[PDB]
Design a protein around this ligand. Structure first.
Ligand SMILES: CCCCCCCCCCCCCCCCCC(=O)O[C@@H](COC(=O)CCCCCCCCCCCCCCC)COP(=O)(O)OC[C@H](O)CO
Ligand SMILES: CCCCCCCCCCCCCCCCCC(=O)O[C@@H](COC(=O)CCCCCCCCCCCCCCC)COP(=O)(O)OC[C@H](O)CO
Ligand SMILES: CC(C)CCC[C@@H](C)[C@H]1CC[C@H]2[C@@H]3CC=C4C[C@@H](OC(=O)CCC(=O)O)CC[C@]4(C)[C@H]3CC[C@]12C
Ligand SMILES: CC(C)CCC[C@@H](C)[C@H]1CC[C@H]2[C@@H]3CC=C4C[C@@H](OC(=O)CCC(=O)O)CC[C@]4(C)[C@H]3CC[C@]12C
Ligand SMILES: CC(C)CCC[C@@H](C)[C@H]1CC[C@H]2[C@@H]3CC=C4C[C@@H](OC(=O)CCC(=O)O)CC[C@]4(C)[C@H]3CC[C@]12C
Ligand SMILES: CC(C)CCC[C@@H](C)[C@H]1CC[C@H]2[C@@H]3CC=C4C[C@@H](OC(=O)CCC(=O)O)CC[C@]4(C)[C@H]3CC[C@]12C
Ligand SMILES: CC(C)CCC[C@@H](C)[C@H]1CC[C@H]2[C@@H]3CC=C4C[C@@H](OC(=O)CCC(=O)O)CC[C@]4(C)[C@H]3CC[C@]12C
Ligand SMILES: CC(C)CCC[C@@H](C)[C@H]1CC[C@H]2[C@@H]3CC=C4C[C@@H](OC(=O)CCC(=O)O)CC[C@]4(C)[C@H]3CC[C@]12C
Ligand SMILES: CC(C)CCC[C@@H](C)[C@H]1CC[C@H]2[C@@H]3CC=C4C[C@@H](OC(=O)CCC(=O)O)CC[C@]4(C)[C@H]3CC[C@]12C
Ligand SMILES: CC(C)CCC[C@@H](C)[C@H]1CC[C@H]2[C@@H]3CC=C4C[C@@H](OC(=O)CCC(=O)O)CC[C@]4(C)[C@H]3CC[C@]12C
Ligand SMILES: CC(C)CCC[C@@H](C)[C@H]1CC[C@H]2[C@@H]3CC=C4C[C@@H](OC(=O)CCC(=O)O)CC[C@]4(C)[C@H]3CC[C@]12C
Ligand SMILES: CC(C)CCC[C@@H](C)[C@H]1CC[C@H]2[C@@H]3CC=C4C[C@@H](OC(=O)CCC(=O)O)CC[C@]4(C)[C@H]3CC[C@]12C
Ligand SMILES: CC(C)CCC[C@@H](C)[C@H]1CC[C@H]2[C@@H]3CC=C4C[C@@H](OC(=O)CCC(=O)O)CC[C@]4(C)[C@H]3CC[C@]12C
Ligand SMILES: CC(C)CCC[C@@H](C)[C@H]1CC[C@H]2[C@@H]3CC=C4C[C@@H](OC(=O)CCC(=O)O)CC[C@]4(C)[C@H]3CC[C@]12C
Ligand SMILES: *[C@@H]1O[C@H](CO)[C@@H](O)[C@H](O)[C@H]1NC(C)=O
Ligand SMILES: *[C@@H]1O[C@H](CO)[C@@H](O)[C@H](O)[C@H]1NC(C)=O
Lengths: 523, 523
């Protein structure tokens, strides 16, 4: 018990005379998240309403391909970070590519540069009369910008978190946990700022002045990272010998091709440290495999919550003061970020000292399990509200308006969704941060960035699996999602059964993860 | 890992050349459970339909008082067992009193002895015309029989399980766990036999031949226990010095009135063994306190499941072969016992070796937590089905008949309740047995019977709290249970809102028990 009081000194003194570097890292992450969410908030709507009038399916496919590229680029970004380059140099290069890729969109928004670019001058005005039509216009420039921005965001996401984690490595794991808590807090703050301001300006002022802001944000992030590079000296990895470790991994795999790994490696050139690294990698891979369904259910629930909210009563007299012409569809997603922003400081200042006080959770796997339990509870709560609505809709309906689509909603207030998101928020403040901590703690000291990239890649694989599951349940044979051929007509479909299925999947995943976590802790 | 294989020898060899004693104990428990369930199956109906026509409220109060006496007598039964007597002697005395108390009811069933007894000859025939009416008739004999049978069943319940547990104490805890598994299996088998046969005979043939069978059952149990007493020699406690220990407990409490207990006891005569005993008691009491809500929710869900089943379609062509005149209302409760009988052998033969194989659960507290998680999942599942029914009832209804009351049920098959009970069954085969094992394992070797009595008393307190909660939710101010002024008309009430409340209570209790179990394991 007294050792907990001893470690409380490190916990309180975690932010020693190095706070400037932590602030710079948090600010860079906040600006990067703001730019990313500004880009991803209204990409489909921007593509549809642009003079290059794409189809809705084409815009959805483009956004999905961009997201998949962002998920896929993380392991390669980590490889580039730890091999042939340093961590800070990789961050700088990725941010430069990020800015270069994102600069394309404001030029496309501006009519003069839009006409100058794409060599096509497509002004068919969508519904305006026209002699037939062509395929996706402005394809080269748009695709180049999308691939550049996706690669940049993937690389920064893979590389920034382990760098900031090792920045405070001098202290104990409690310092790393506090840093990850504030890192997630900064991420949510940036997401809130973006989803509010950038979406408001894009939907209600202009795209030309809307897409210019993310470019300024990424420029500020690059500038602050460059300025803080001089004062960082956060024990830079300076990766030049780490390149050898990756090929020693391939040699260890060839040992399989030519504790078996340890018994062959012993007298073999494979030195003990590389043996421990490969054994750790083999141990940690199943943890990611078990976490895949958690990512699936989390992403699917995040997607379905906005759809559920779209068909509830819009509160607050529909913003009577300064009437919201074409109310943006980003604040519904921002509810979760607001709840996380409220929860995180309270957790960090109260719960962590209380848990660490007597004997409670010293490991992240248990926190992930608790978060998954909260996810299952939130899924059950969401299922119930959906069921009542699908029966309370049988009565008269009220024609509301979000954006420029006349939604049909029941006479049920939106605030009834406060519990679900609340549980979700709790789950996140237990799960995600802990997972990040695990992704930093169990990884070998030479290839943390690669492990982070694999973590994000597996999260993306889970998201893709969730989208595929939604497509599967959309089949007429089941009939749960049959009228969902547009922005949303959930009135004619059963989402409560889908919520219950998500809850059951989350429960099974929780049991499997408990088993796997116990096995990992044993070894 | 190899030590698990070493303990597998004890696990397989648990039933050494002492199986006759285990069989005798299991048979005695089975007969006692059969007699108890035969008594409690149709007590209210027997009292109402008897020539001494009581009121429904009076019969319900009598049954509740009997159940409360059974719950309260357990700690005093354990005290009598460990003080001034032995375990076997206490069992024999309690079974003799059990038989003496239960013998009263068949005499009351027989018209000749009924007229001979009670000195009243009350033959008002309930609805038959009569010049006013009196209070509860046959009060002295019925009350004496009820108090005797309650005290006997309380004492046997408090004493038999620790005796059988220490019967196999020669081997390791795995032998005790297997014995408790088969003990619960025998309990469920006896409950099935009673609820089927005795209830069918009572409701469809006669009370005179119905209540005679439990007397034969308890006589057989007493005879087999007496015969096996000679060959038992299961290291009998022969409690005579144990009495001293109990008074030393008060002396420890005298330290309160005159680790404070340990620091005072070291200089005091209180020898270390008594200090360890009192410290263990103080440690274990909070476990029972935390288990109280689990008992509350379990008993309440058990009660509400029969009511939910009563309003579903009766399956199997209403037993077309040998038409069931006045279908008994006990098989609905027997569904859970049937599921437990199916589950227990599979668990014992497959799950326990698999769990014990690599690294899994060595402690009962985690099993109790898993059982409570399954309880919460079953509660959520039950809530959903009830919600659908309360909406599927809005259509036409079908007038079924169970017993002699015309119930109103929806066109939904009873088999849809198979999942709920299944989860419930799993929960039990995780929770109850483990709790029993804990109640035997953590208790001091001198006063195991007292700890078992306290365990059963706290379970009864939880059941009373659950009944009080149901009475509280019955208030018009909430309105969840407003038309439930009879056998049951849940068609007009919201049972789903309750099921969800039970699920939430179980969810909170799970976290509380996890915290308390971790604290107990630390100390
Ligand atoms: C290791 C990974 C395993 C796979 C994990 C992926 C997810 C598994 C769970 C998949 C859930 C599928 C849907 C639920 C299964 C029952 C089928 C079903 O949907 O039944 C419908 C009934 O439809 C059918 O019976 C159609 C059967 C189609 C066959 C394909 C689905 C069966 C399951 C396939 C996947 C296998 C899963 C195995 C169990 C996990 C009920 O809806 P309804 O028609 O009553 O809807 C209400 C209203 O009446 C509107 O119609
Ligand atoms: C450490 C132990 C703590 C206590 C543990 C015991 C159990 C705690 C939980 C008790 C749950 C009580 C019921 C739920 C609380 C909200 C009140 C309620 O029932 O609201 C109803 C609305 O009624 C009211 O607002 C009446 C309020 C009466 C005041 C008493 C109840 C409040 C809670 C008292 C217990 C305190 C619990 C605190 C939180 C745990 C909703 O039903 P309805 O009328 O909409 O029903 C459907 C239809 O319309 C039919 O009417
Ligand atoms: C949600 C739906 C789409 C399914 C999700 C994918 C599952 C099929 C995956 C997710 C987690 C996977 C498990 C993660 C870890 C392992 C440990 C693994 O065993 C090892 O330790 C690997 C090394 C060895 O072979 O000894 C065996 C496969 C298994 C059970 C995996 C089996 C396949 C699982 C269940
Ligand atoms: C571990 C602890 C925190 C308990 C775990 C379970 C709870 C998180 C669950 C159990 C029951 C659930 C509730 C059951 C039903 C509802 C009603 C539901 O709304 C409706 O269906 C109607 C609301 C209305 O219009 O009045 C909103 C979620 C809520 C409050 C749920 C919130 C989450 C609860 C409390
Ligand atoms: C903050 C957390 C922990 C509390 C649990 C969820 C709350 C956010 C809920 C509980 C009570 C709810 C209120 C209870 C009753 C109603 C009436 C309800 O009105 C209707 O159902 C009719 C709608 C109409 O006709 O206008 C509108 C929502 C409101 C204010 C609810 C808003 C959301 C509240 C505050
Ligand atoms: C190679 C082996 C190990 C399988 C692992 C590959 C995954 C990354 C794949 C397997 C199934 C794939 C999914 C299967 C089905 C679909 C539905 C598909 O949706 C549509 O194109 C129709 C709906 C629409 O128009 O939006 C989009 C891709 C997606 C999610 C796929 C995404 C990528 C997934 C998850
Ligand atoms: C963790 C996963 C892999 C397994 C558990 C998934 C469950 C959450 C799913 C699978 C089967 C589903 C059920 C399949 C079919 C139906 C019937 C459907 O319509 C009816 O009630 C009509 C029933 C009838 O046809 O008689 C309502 C949803 C329900 C209960 C579904 C609810 C959600 C269930 C239980
Ligand atoms: C009885 C039959 C019907 C069960 C069939 C399914 C089992 C094989 C599954 C269902 C629930 C599972 C359990 C769910 C949760 C846990 C708790 C978990 O507890 C821990 O060790 C937590 C960590 C710690 O205590 O330090 C270990 C795995 C275990 C027992 C799982 C083992 C596998 C179980 C028993
Ligand atoms: C379901 C509804 C009716 C409520 C159920 C009763 C609760 C009010 C009880 C059940 C479990 C109890 C807890 C069980 C154990 C403890 C440990 C106890 O602390 C000790 O270790 C006692 C010795 C000491 O004082 O140091 C303090 C009270 C507390 C939290 C109890 C507080 C009261 C609780 C929550
Ligand atoms: C940890 C693992 C075991 C998963 C934990 C959660 C499951 C045990 C839950 C999640 C969703 C639940 C299901 C959700 C809805 C229903 C429908 C319900 O019946 C209805 O409402 C309609 C039935 C019909 O007519 O088809 C019966 C329970 C059931 C199958 C539930 C059974 C229990 C399930 C699978
Ligand atoms: C064994 C466990 C693991 C499986 C899950 C629950 C089963 C017991 C369920 C799943 C499918 C169910 C069946 C699916 C469909 C129906 C049709 C259903 O009919 C109606 O809903 C209309 C009633 C009428 O009009 O007569 C009657 C019950 C039944 C046979 C159900 C009985 C209960 C079943 C077998
Ligand atoms: C002394 C302190 C530590 C409290 C602990 C005592 C408990 C054993 C008490 C407290 C509240 C009591 C309950 C309060 C209210 C009721 C409702 C009451 O129901 C009725 O008489 C009305 C309904 C009917 O007629 O059946 C039956 C007794 C009961 C369950 C009580 C049973 C005994 C309880 C649980
Ligand atoms: C863990 C325990 C101690 C606290 C949590 C218990 C919950 C499961 C209970 C407490 C409050 C209950 C809610 C209180 C009131 C309502 C409204 C009731 O009616 C309505 O939907 C309309 C209400 C209105 O008119 O505003 C439906 C059930 C519901 C959501 C209840 C569902 C069950 C809840 C969430
Ligand atoms: C973030 C805020 C809103 C939470 C407010 C409530 C907390 C004080 C509660 C909610 C959930 C509780 C947790 C639910 C379950 C667990 C797991 C339990 O895990 C173990 O210790 C298992 C055994 C082992 O690890 O060896 C420890 C207590 C803990 C963290 C509980 C501690 C207290 C918590 C965090
Ligand atoms: C539609 O036509 C108007 C008037 O010619 C023009 O100003 C506007 O830019 C066009 N819109 C698009 C989206 O090309
Ligand atoms: C009712 O009266 C009949 C005929 O007199 C008698 O046989 C029967 O025992 C009475 N029933 C009861 C319950 O006393």
């Amino acid at each position: 018990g007294a050792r907990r009081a001893a470690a409380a000194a490190a916990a309180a003194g975690a932010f020693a005379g190095r706070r400037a570097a932590c602030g710079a890292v948090l600010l860079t992450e906040l600006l990067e998240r703001a730019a990313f969410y500004g880009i991803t908030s209204n990409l489909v709507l921007f593509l549809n309403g642009a003079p290059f009038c794409w189809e809705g399916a084409q815009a959805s496919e483009a956004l999905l391909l961009f997201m998949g590229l962002t998920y896929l680029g993380s392991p390669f970004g980590g490889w580039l970070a730890d091999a042939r380059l340093g961590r800070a140099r990789a961050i700088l290069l990725s941010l430069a590519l990020y800015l270069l890729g994102m600069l394309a969109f404001p030029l496309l928004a501006a009519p003069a540069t839009r006409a100058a670019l794409c060599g096509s001058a497509r002004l068919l005005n969508c519904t305006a009369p026209g002699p037939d039509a062509a395929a996706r216009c402005c394809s080269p420039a748009t695709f180049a910008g999308l691939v550049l921005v996706g690669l940049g965001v993937a690389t920064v996401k893979a590389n920034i978190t382990p760098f900031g984690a090792d920045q405070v490595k001098d202290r104990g794991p409690e310092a790393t946990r506090r840093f990850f808590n504030w890192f997630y807090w900064s991420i949510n703050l940036g997401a809130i700022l973006s989803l509010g301001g950038i979406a408001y300006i894009q939907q209600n002022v202009s795209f030309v002045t809307g897409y210019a802001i993310p470019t300024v944000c990424v420029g500020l992030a690059f500038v602050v990272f460059l300025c803080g590079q001089s004062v960082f000296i956060t024990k830079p990895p300076d990766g030049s010998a780490f390149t050898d470790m990756f090929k020693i991994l391939t040699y260890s795999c060839c040992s399989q091709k030519r504790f078996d790994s340890c018994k062959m490696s012993h007298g073999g050139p494979f030195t003990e440290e590389k043996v421990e690294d490969v054994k750790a990698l083999v141990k940690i891979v199943p943890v990611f495999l078990a976490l895949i369904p958690y990512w699936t259910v989390y992403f699917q629930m995040q997607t379905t919550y906005v759809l559920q909210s779209l068909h509830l009563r819009i509160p607050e007299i529909s913003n009577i003061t300064t009437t919201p012409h074409t109310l943006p569809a980003a604040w519904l997603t921002m509810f979760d970020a607001v709840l996380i922003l409220l929860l995180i400081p309270l957790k960090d200042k109260l719960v962590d000292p209380i848990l660490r006080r007597h004997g409670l959770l010293p490991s992240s796997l248990k926190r992930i399990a608790v978060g998954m339990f909260f996810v299952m509870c939130s899924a059950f709560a969401a299922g119930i509200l959906e069921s009542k609505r699908l029966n309370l809709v049988k009565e008269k309906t009220i024609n509301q308006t979000i954006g420029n689509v006349v939604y049909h909603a029941a006479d049920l207030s939106l605030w009834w969704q406060v519990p679900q998101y609340l549980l979700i928020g709790i789950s996140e403040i237990f799960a995600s941060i802990a997972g990040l901590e695990f992704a930093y703690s169990a990884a070998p000291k030479s290839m943390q960035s690669a492990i982070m990239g694999l973590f994000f890649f597996f999260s993306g694989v889970g998201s893709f699996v969730g989208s595929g599951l939604l497509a599967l349940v959309s089949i007429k044979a089941i009939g749960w999602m049959s009228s969902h051929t547009d922005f949303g007509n959930i009135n004619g479909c059963y989402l409560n059964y889908y919520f219950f299925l998500l809850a059951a999947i989350q429960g099974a995943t929780l049991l499997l993860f408990l088993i796997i976590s116990v096995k990992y802790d044993h070894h």
